[PDB]
DNA sequence: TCAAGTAAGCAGTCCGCG
DNA sequence: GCGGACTGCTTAC
């Protein structure tokens with residue numbers, strides 16, 4: 001096999017690399033790497049190295065990396081550009097792995113761990129590490145074993161050994177219900193004291209040194225706690241054994257309103273799963289506790305236990321350890337589903353960066369572009385300092401608030417990357433400028449043609465057409481990967497609907513799920529076999545199809561995020577290729593494209609309908625248009641359709657055979673108008689939406705920009721067994737909206753779109769009557785909480801104090817002096833409830849840490865004083881009033897009337 | 904919330920609006 | 922009480 005790196009670091013004048021050799025073995029080496037950098041030189045000087053603008057460069061080879069860094073400094077002193085890759089380890093990787101890396105994940109040691117620390121005086125701060133570590137569970141991917149380190153003797157209590165027998169039993173049997181599939185994979189090690197525990201953990205770490213290190217909050221808690229605890233007990237040299245190169249650094253991470261410390265372990269790649277999740281999941285969660293996320297992702301129940309965690313070890317050490325084990329397994333289960341580790345490895349090895357650099361789109365693209373240019377003996381420019389400047393973005397059309405019965409949407413394929421490719425936007429392809437007219441003039445095709453030589457954007461930029469720029473070339477490669485995975489995702493989605501249909505008529509039999517590849521549309525043979533399967537087998541197949549879809553989603557959406565990130569990086573001052581000319585060339589072209597095609601679609605439909613000056617495009621945002629299809633349906637007459645699926649087929653055919661060819665013609669003309677390099681504006685049908693045939697449903701509505709709902713029957717070729725609500729921006733979609741309120745508002749919307757006004761009125765009446773019975777957590781609002789201190793004046797709200805912050809201050813006064821009460825954490829999220837006048841808390845609201853039950857110290861009083869009236873008005877009625885007013889209907893029945901008497 | 908971008912909505916404070 | 926100037930937070934894209 002070809003070799004591949006595991007980790008790389010620069011330590012002084014040495015590169016330290018861990019790698020897998022040609023025989024599949026892990027090895028480590030220290031290389032006295034001599035870096036090269038470049039300076040411009042005279043033409044009369046024969047060279048093979050040229051900068052991206054074709055200017056000749058001389059290569060300077062340095063005796064060592066320190067000399068190279070010093071030369072860069074002196075070049076700044078002189079006032080001359082120092083060209084080349086200044087991050088020497090990336091240059092090292094480029095030289096050492098000068099080929100497309102094929103990695104073998106089975107050879108990479110991925111460690112997943114979690115620790116427990118009993119603390120009787122509040123949250124145990126990792127920077128102090130003053131309490132014993134009393135449990136560590138460490139899963140190793142190569143061994144496929146959970147290694148459990150259990151402290152039996154501590155100043156906070158001496159306990160008996162954990163029992164694997166009781167751990168396996170059902171909770172109804174008094175057990176901990178540790179999943180049976182991992183019971184045989186646990187290796188349990190009890191310790192008589194903490195020094196022995198930690199010395200053994202370090203010896204173990206030396207034998208099985210993680211390459212990828214993950215877990216939940218490991219970067220902010222577990223890692224620094226272990227490091228600092230060992231440092232406190234044994235000293236610095238021992239703690240540094242956590243690094244394979246015995247090198248660590250305290251890293252200060254700054255944010256707008258403060259900073260925190262982490263520990264960098266040279267030679268390890270830490271990928272904290274909470275951060276992988278936040279980056280790759282495309283969720284915004286009301287809480288990021290492992291229990292909350294596990295429930296959301298896996299539908300597992302939260303780990304139950306009596307009393308506070310600070311007393312759990314002494315009261316129930318059995319459960320304490322079992323829950324530490326389960327915590328590690330939960331992260332493994334989330335990854336089995338989401339596959340974020342796989343994704344990180346793919347991206348990291350593709351770019352040739354430290355794996356943890358996947359968190360930085362700028363570092364990722366810097367490396368991809370550097371490797372691409374290096375292959376042509378080209379030399380990258382030096383990064384420069386730029387002042388931050390705002391610049392313009394996408395166009396969003398103002399919709400007329402209203403119901404919209406039949407709607408068809410269209411959207412451009414990966415817009416910004418396609419614009420980069422079409423126009424040929426790149427640092428080195430800038431050809432010049434042209435005198436710009438008002439955007440309106442280009443949209444209406446009355447401005448004079450920008451250029452008859454170069455490819456243009458309506459921001460005034462021109463680009464070469466003789467050769468692709470490095471940005472277009474490299475963005476295309478990642479786009480093509482994204483396209484492949486999106487294909488698998490959609491097939492799995494379509495396959496899912498096939499199974500859902502079959503689940504309506506399952507066979508009464510005992511059988512097994514079919515062995516199929518869900519990434520490809522089911523063949524006729526498979527479909528025939530599916531109709532003869534039991535419900536048990538069908539549901540298992542559905543689960544597998546959905547997991548396949550999720551894997552496809554992870555792979556496709558995050559590759560799209562990467563290429564969108566390149567477009568955005570052009571507008572970030574820290575990017576080597578930062579250039580507002582290029583950033584704005586993309587966004588401005590996007591604004592034109594959207595409004596150009598709005599005009600073309602309107603013109604086309606006015607022609608087909610024999611109307612004039614009517615607006616068929618009701619809305620658009622960035623790269624999508626929404627088209628009213630009422631008139632199209634009406635030309636046939638709703639009476640001629642057999643069922644809902646019949647008119648859906650009709651619209652699907654109309655979009656593909658009539659509208660899309662017209663759309664293509666429009667964009668081809670725009671391409672010629674801008675003299676672009678390649679036509680890549682590909683816009684096809686996305687959604688088909690409308691009410692169920694014969695119903696009083698309204699189909700859809702808009703309240704304003706970025707706020708709408710549609711009853712969708714077909715989404716990009718996936719025909720749904722049951723209609724699916726597409727709701728964007730509305731309160732149902734916001735993590736700040738109470739859980740039970742999201743549910744209720746969604747049902748109100750469903751009834752509006754599918755059933756009509758009377759159905760909505762019936763549901764509203766019921767919810768209003770019963771909502772006071774809802775669990776307090778399900779009706780609490782949620783908010784991030786920043787700058788708590790700023791608004792704290794003697795424990796009371798200062799001027800302009802935000803409502804959620806006021807709630808936190810109320811909470812803080814209520815638990816004052818209690819060292820065991822949960823503390824609100826600056827920057828994290830809280831639940832918020834309004835309080836009735838005259839309450840003992842002394843203010844109109846209270847807030848506590850999100851994802852948790854409010855402390856028993858005050859719970860009863862909070863429950864007693866909750867202001868249900870205010871809660872309902874703010875979170876439910878106000879938003880519903882917005883939906884219904886926009887849709888021109890009433891959630892409460894109006895005077896009959898027509899009572900007229902009895903009945 | 905360390906880590907590519909902009910557009911734009913709603914809640915809430917403060918306070919004018921004769 | 923509504924709504925502009927402002928902050929804070931959250932979406933869509």
Ligand SMILES: O=c1ccn([C@H]2C[C@H](O)[C@@H](COP(=O)(O)NP(=O)(O)OP(=O)(O)O)O2)c(=O)[nH]1
Nearest residue numbers: 411412413414415416417564568622623908934
């Ligand atoms: O996080 C984002 C999202 C979108 N955008 C821009 C770029 C993107 O091309 C455009 C449209 O975004 P979408 O992801 O909604 N769709 P896109 O057209 O990029 O891909 P596709 O439609 O093929 O899924 O908005 C960003 O810059 N950052």
Ligand SMILES: [Mg+2]
Nearest residue numbers: 411412413414
């Ligand atoms: Mg698109």
